[PDB]
Write a sequence for this structure.
């Protein structure tokens, strides 16, 4: 449910 940038970016 969370985003992607949260791990793919920051």
């Amino acid at each position: 449910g969370n985003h992607w940038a949260v791990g793919h970016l920051m």
In short: The longest helix spans residues 5-8. Helices lie at 5-8. The two ends are 17 Å apart (CA to CA). The chain is about 40% helix and 0% strand.
